[PDB]
Amino acid sequence: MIKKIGVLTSGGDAPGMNAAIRGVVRSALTEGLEVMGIYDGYLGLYEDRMVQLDRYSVSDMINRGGTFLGSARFPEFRDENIRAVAIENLKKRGIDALVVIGGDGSYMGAMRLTEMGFPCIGLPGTIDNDIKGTDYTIGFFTALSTVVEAIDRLRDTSSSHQRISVVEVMGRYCGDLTLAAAIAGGCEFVVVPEVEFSREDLVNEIKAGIAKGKKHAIVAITEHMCDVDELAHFIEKETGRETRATVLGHIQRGGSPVPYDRILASRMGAYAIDLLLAGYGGRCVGIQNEQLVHHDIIDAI
Amino acid sequence: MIKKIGVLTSGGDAPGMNAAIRGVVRSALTEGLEVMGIYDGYLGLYEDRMVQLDRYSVSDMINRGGTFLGSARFPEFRDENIRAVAIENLKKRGIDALVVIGGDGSYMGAMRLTEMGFPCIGLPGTIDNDIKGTDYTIGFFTALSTVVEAIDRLRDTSSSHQRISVVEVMGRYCGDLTLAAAIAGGCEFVVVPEVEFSREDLVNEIKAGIAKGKKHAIVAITEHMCDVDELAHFIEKETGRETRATVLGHIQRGGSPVPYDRILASRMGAYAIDLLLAGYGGRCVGIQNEQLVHHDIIDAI
Numbered sequence: 179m180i181k182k183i184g185v186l187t188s189g190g191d192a193p194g195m196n197a198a199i200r201g202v203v204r205s206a207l208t209e210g211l212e213v214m215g216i217y218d219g220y221l222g223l224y225e226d227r228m229v230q231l232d233r234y235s236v237s238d239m240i241n242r243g244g245t246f247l248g249s250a251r252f253p254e255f256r257d258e259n260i261r262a263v264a265i266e267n268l269k270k271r272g273i274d275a276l277v278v279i280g281g282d283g284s285y286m287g288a289m290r291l292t293e294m295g296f297p298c299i300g301l302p303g304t305i306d307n308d309i310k311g312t313d314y315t316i317g318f319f320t321a322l323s324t325v326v327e328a329i330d331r332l333r334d335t336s337s338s339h340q341r342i343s344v345v346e347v348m349g350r351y352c353g354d355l356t357l358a359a360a361i362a363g364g365c366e367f368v369v370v371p372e373v374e375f376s377r378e379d380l381v382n383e384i385k386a387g388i389a390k391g392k393k394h395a396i397v398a399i400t401e402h403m404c405d406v407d408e409l410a411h412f413i414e415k416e417t418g419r420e421t422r423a424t425v426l427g428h429i430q431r432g433g434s435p436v437p438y439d440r441i442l443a444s445r446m447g448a449y450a451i452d453l454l455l456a457g458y459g460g461r462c463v464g465i466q467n468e469q470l471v472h473h474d475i476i477d478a479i
Numbered sequence: 480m481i482k483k484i485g486v487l488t489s490g491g492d493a494p495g496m497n498a499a500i501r502g503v504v505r506s507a508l509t510e511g512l513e514v515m516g517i518y519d520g521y522l523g524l525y526e527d528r529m530v531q532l533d534r535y536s537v538s539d540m541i542n543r544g545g546t547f548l549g550s551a552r553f554p555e556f557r558d559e560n561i562r563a564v565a566i567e568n569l570k571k572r573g574i575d576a577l578v579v580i581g582g583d584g585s586y587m588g589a590m591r592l593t594e595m596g597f598p599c600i601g602l603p604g605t606i607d608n609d610i611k612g613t614d615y616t617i618g619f620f621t622a623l624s625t626v627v628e629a630i631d632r633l634r635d636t637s638s639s640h641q642r643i644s645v646v647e648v649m650g651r652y653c654g655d656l657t658l659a660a661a662i663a664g665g666c667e668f669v670v671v672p673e674v675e676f677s678r679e680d681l682v683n684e685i686k687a688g689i690a691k692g693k694k695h696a697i698v699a700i701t702e703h704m705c706d707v708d709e710l711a712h713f714i715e716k717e718t719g720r721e722t723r724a725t726v727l728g729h730i731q732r733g734g735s736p737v738p739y740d741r742i743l744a745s746r747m748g749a750y751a752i753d754l755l756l757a758g759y760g761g762r763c764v765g766i767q768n769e770q771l772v773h774h775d776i777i778d779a780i
Contacts (some may be wrong), residue, residue, distance in 0.1 A: 233692075234692075241634075241665075319739070323737060326741070330542050330735075358738065359738075362541075362741040437620070437624055437660075438620070440663040467769065
């Protein structure tokens, strides 16, 4: 029976990580436990930079973007000697288990602390949705709103001037953000990593749309597939239509979490506390067909 | 075969109805069908007020609130007489099937019409989520966003002055909206029609949070449950804490559809064309464990 737990965020921040830390904290207290907030992911874990979290300390966190505890990249956690100090730290402090909020990367280290006998629950926090065992990641729907309001603005100007617009969306390895954005935004063309993409094809496709009388278009494309400035020039050479690329970049990582992310994060946070209480460890949470489910970390890794 | 479909919106309007009409129109055209837009729901059908829809006509609708075709009440549609005239009109305009968008109210008329020989498809369009056979209705996620945005503003002001705020959410017979809003909102107390409510337990509940240190609070309650000014009076009287009621009202029904809704409405509008082409009739669409499904309308009604 666990008496005190630690909570941390690791990986790229996502809107809702704060609602999730609030969920863990409020649940934990309700169940008589003590919570220790760990700064900067595994780095602050390793350096022993922590803080005692109470009801008051998470009272204004639900509508706030980012992660109030910070996130770092501490690749050096792949090392036994470094994990060694992590455990010693946790031990000195009397922390029984840990909630880890983050991407695929953060799960790895959650597994490893499980093996050195530190029960860990992983909560999926990432804007790209690239986590197995969950329908959705925390932060996805927020990024989807950011991307679609941007598209809406780009459509206004594209349409004023009869131009073709190329928007570069985040989610390096997963087409979710882009595809969803393409649909919500009413974009004519979409380019995802999961589909055989041909510049030549695309260009034909636009020419056809034009010829039927489309005066403008919007092309949604996932980052790291093309050089969008170059793609834009290509498109323009073949259609004679003025083409401009827009890279939304890091605005997609920010902002106040939409309601789905506030709810998802709230529900997963409380549920992680449930799992810790029943003595589980090395588990990762998910939402499947509107139901909270939990899997063996290894399955996500 | 099927050559021409008609499309209408019935019941209270919902954000995403324009996206649904666009999904229908676009799918139909792609399949060589001719599309007819029917004004003011069932009233327009009876009075033969329609418009030929084309690509250009929905080219801009994905991000628009309300319904461009408009929606009206014509309870008169129950009377067989009235529906014969509607039949006379359909027959005359050469409409083979109908895609109806709206509440359970609108589904009734879709059963009648199928029975008389015109295959109807019903799409769930409502802000309250009170439609059977679907995880979610179109407009629900958009109303939730309106409500949480409002709750966020109420929290700033309630906070500043150490007040209890009572907010009345829509959905008479379904607490779904209130519940989601309370959680997404961080509301300390919620009153839905699904749970027995004691005015008294609510006060103890609140007296409690106070002594435990809460300086302010937000109580989310569904409409048609209480006089909210009367309840605010009562709470003020018992706790000695300044309490105010805010009734969001119709702002809940309007605005630009959030991403979820745009997508939902998009897939459902297309899918309805797919059902119609495959031979189905008197079916109603829904989303279930993230998959599009269809049911006998008699089970949703």
